[PDB]
Symmetry: T
Subunit: 144 residues, 12 copies
């Protein structure tokens, strides 16, 4: 699996997670509501940035980003969430597991782009790893 393919799969994961976290946003229950509600807004606004970043990296490489939701659904490795009620504990557990998935995928992006001498994608992959590793650390602490 080569660089543009990894990016396209990640673009698909970003839009799917943009959606899944909106679900958490709307359907969180319990007294720390304002907190989760606030934090989920910042998270899905991050996914939409990731989505746009990945797409423009694909274009700059000479390839076509994904341009439909059905292609997103075809290419994603993320399970969509159908439940409609959550406490902060359940939401943080879900987001953690997805963060861990993305962390593995950005690690492969980094390593594969290095093998092809694509320095700009390495730098981009390494910047996302830094953000993911920090969020994973924080979420791991929420659950302890």
């Amino acid at each position: 699996m080569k660089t543009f393919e990894i990016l396209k799969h990640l673009q698909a994961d970003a839009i799917v997670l943009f959606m899944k976290v909106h679900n958490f946003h709307w359907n969180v229950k319990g007294t720390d509501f304002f907190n989760v509600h606030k934090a989920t807004e910042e998270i899905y606004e991050g996914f939409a940035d990731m989505f746009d970043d990945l797409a423009e990296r694909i274009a700059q490489l000479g390839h076509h980003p994904l341009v439909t939701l059905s292609e997103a659904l075809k290419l994603t490795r993320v399970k969509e969430e159908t439940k409609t009620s959550f406490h902060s504990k359940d939401i943080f557990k879900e987001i953690l597991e997805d963060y861990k998935h993305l962390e593995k995928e950005f690690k492969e992006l980094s390593n594969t782009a290095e093998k092809e001498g694509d320095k700009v994608t390495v730098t981009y992959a390494d910047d996302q790893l830094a953000k993911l590793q920090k969020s994973i650390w924080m979420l791991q602490a929420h659950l302890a």
Copy 2:
């Protein structure tokens, strides 16, 4: 078709159009590139607001917003765009036709919510009509 059903169909249209306009964003060609590129960013940021607005209106009404992309695709009336190259003329024509569709749908939202005495949804529907009518006017002028 009752108020929450109309809202849910519109929520589905917003996410699908959020995606379609990203396509225009990435794939516009020609010398007014910066202009289109800039304008499409403002448009899909509007769809994501519309998406979140509609969802929270659905929740406040006691119902569940849509929480998956496959439900978006099931409920939408919008055709997804598979082409990957455009000039500003082609993009503006597409966006106009979709604006006209939404304008009809928000008109039905307004009228149906009035029949049920749902004043808050009327006000919301009427605010979106004002924005749509202004954008339609402007787009109609781009194409003249």
Copy 3:
């Protein structure tokens, strides 16, 4: 009961609730203290805006707003709170019930002002309903 009378009763409720929520502000206990303390500040600052809005709507209609606390106490439908210690759960339950009361009263304001052809008051009533319905939704979620 006619438009200016409904407004005056609501003006009385706003000042009384401005006070009741200060009580919650000062007397909240437990580890989410900063959260409640912050949120109550935003709530009673909203009541004081509501108080000033209702008063100036009364004046514009040709009538006198209420100008004393004893008239507030005479006209209010809100029970004053004498307790001086609370957790976030108790505070959110109280505020919800009062929000529901105001929501019924703004609904009557809307309907009565429509019967008299007072469009400006309808618009104002409908704007407050939108805010109340959103806050009710959120508070209902805090308690689930």
Copy 4:
């Protein structure tokens, strides 16, 4: 008289009042000069917004806004002011009477647009009524 006709007459009134209030701006006498001078600036900047708002509402409806001063003068119901010296009392009396005129005209705009099912114009008419009713209240108080 139908919706676009009422709007066009109002567009004509806005430009004429934009001018009349500049006259007050320049020609106010007495020790509260800074006050009037300041307030008239805010008033004619409001008329120019009203002028541009009405024009773009006319365009969105499929019709042509007025595009010349002589058409403004043909269609206006406002008497132009030829005097060149005033105290604050004289200025506030003039502006009040014109505000009352506009308030009647926006009331007809609201009612006529309702009869045609033009929701966006109703909302716009109702927003201007709210501003006019507040300014009328204040000006009525200046003169008491």
Copy 5:
């Protein structure tokens, strides 16, 4: 009369004056309307800060602030104003006399808190005296 008692009486005066000055705000007549209207807004926003400051000082001392309007009315030394029409001269005279009252009361707060070694309350009392003495000076000049 000991420190917390003086504070509680002052808390009662602040809410009562918050109300009385709203009356001036709404019911001022004459050509300097914008001025009074503006100044009264800044004054009652000061009383609400004073109200919240005094309450939190009471809490920090281990005691309960007042939490109802009827307790405000029981403890206040301020006469509520029932009239509903004023010129700037009448309003400034009223506010001056109330400022003088508060100045005497904050002087006693300062002296009593010194006798108990309550340095934080002294500093707070002395800060309010500085504000009151400046406002008294200015109001005394309005009336000369």
Copy 6:
């Protein structure tokens, strides 16, 4: 023709051009719509500043600015535009010719005010020439 007369004729031209450019604003057609629409807004906001500047210069000189639209129409040298549809090319050509006219008139203002020793008007005339010469240069480039 003496200084105050030249200023008054220019005041008349500014209001007439304020109007003519609103026409361009509303009635521009073609794909660079956002651009023209944006630029015309900045242009007529400049004319309204010019209008107010000229008027206050007239007042400071001891004379009366023009205070009616019919006096504007009597004194102007600008032809009002009755057409209601344009491309950017047609709009820029129109605005250029009017800029050239104003440039000649501000040159006469400068020279005549110098002959009377009116230094403040010279400085003002010279500042407007600088702005006009820059805009003329730019518009001349649009059409090449």
Copy 7:
């Protein structure tokens, strides 16, 4: 009297007027107190800028600005004000007469600097004339 001499006399007038207007600031009586108090602050902050501007112009010319109050008093043409109570009418009359004096002096600065080919001082003199002529116009209107 040559350029640096005119500047030095003006520097002396600026500091003396800085002081005289502080007197007005502190000692104004009557209900428009806030207005005068505000306006005098802006006026003496202008004199202190004028003072610093004139001084640095003197230095740039190779000469020494005045560096003591007694030299200010020796060189000034302004009468110091010993009274300690005023209404807005008395204050505006005083400031007008001093503005007229400065206007004559800046006119001589302009003409003398022209005779010596000192373009920078001309430009500076002409900028102060513009400010003075505008303030004179406004003050003349306060007194009508």
Copy 8:
């Protein structure tokens, strides 16, 4: 123990608490993570201000602030925390006890500086007491 000695001991406590609270910052566990994490950042940024304030007060008095960590450790009365995992409850209890300690020490600073006639240090001590008393109140409420 004289004024500069009390200040130096407090400087030592501030740096030690700056460190201890970083520990809480990094090692907090549980779902209100964002809250604690946020609040601890604001707390240790306060200690570093206190540290710099105390040091510059010592210098202004003619003495040397502490300039090494080992001198901090020699002079501090605060126990360093070696544990590396906490919930919000444990953190708030720790911070409260340290706040109470500092409150006693600033009380002695105030009283000792009064005995020496050092007014600036009294004012500084009294300002820190106000902040400490407010934070103690809030923390006491977190634990109820």
Copy 9:
């Protein structure tokens, strides 16, 4: 010498020092020019604040501030500086000695206002001491 007398003498010192430091501002020589030039601007802007503060404190006490430069010169204890060339070393030495003078005078203000029970003036005196003691410390370091 009683409180208002001490204040009036200090008002006289502030205006005289405002002037003396302008001299330093204009006439500093050497390579750290920008530094001194910058710092002197901040210093004389402080004196003008001190001047206005002292004056309004005098007024609030029922007395007349000084309103002429000749009264400033009569009452000041500060020697005016006639030299017109300095290095940073000479300027800092001068400013230090004047700071020390003011520090003694504000100490007497504090002590005398305490004897009369004038708490607001004490607080004001103590705030100026804090600023003076900090500046003295810094200037003493410049010269070491």
Copy 10:
């Protein structure tokens, strides 16, 4: 060719391109004038940053940046543009080819600095590649 040599050649290219793009800025013709004019300003402001960045990287490495235009002209690989009239199409083609050149040169900077273990220059080279690749993508789209 070693790291400092590559940097110095790039410094020479940046100043030469800073100049060439000013030419485009001034001499662009056609109706999208504002667009090009705006974009060229942002481009040559980027070259001047690149120029200063490269120079300070050279200095930090122990070597001398280029300090004359004739050394710029000696070392540059960029052809200077002598034509003085362009449409947006011609300008974008020119800038693209130069962007491609710089992209090759920054790729060599990256690879050579890696061979010498100069991590800071690699990071800097990789950051410029990211910017260049994005601009190349966009310009390539302008021309399609």
Copy 11:
């Protein structure tokens, strides 16, 4: 030598001085490093503004600005600096002499543009003289 020729020679001087001052920026030695480094940045950012100003003035006059570095070098009267190490004293001396040169050249620009009746260029020349005369004054003081 006529107006456009003088401007073009000055454009050449601005780019050459932009470069020479970058040299000072990078190569200043000694403890006031931050100061020089800061000041040189502000100076060469001024030259680049001067460069762009002169160029656009040339274009507005109907002529071609210089568009290559070799034309800059051909037309300049400024000696390029080849040294690569300086103290603040050496840098300020260099910049002063170049400021004096530009001051003579802008004086000729002013006088020649007056002879041709080119008012806009006079105003521009006179504005640059004001800036140059102020900087010359300051630099002359650095060296005393």
Copy 12:
């Protein structure tokens, strides 16, 4: 020595240098006082950021940051400074040598993290090297 060990030693160096530079801050002597005083504040605010950055990197790696000053003192390689008086020359020499030390240590962090495939730490190490290399360059210039 492995990655987390290098980070922990650096965390210890950051807190120790945070302290040492406070010493320079407080105890600098001579006329460029404001400069050093300002620069040291920016430097120790950088160390506290470095301290917090290193700590959170340690936590994200699964290890415990240092949480006591005595552990800082145990692990540091930096000599604490006991002197209490300095000129800018002495301070800059000290800070340079410590910057050089940190530069060697961040180089080892980079190389060791590369050997373990820890990309996020490499990126972080390389970002600190860039800052250190720039500061070293500047400090080296201060001392030349």
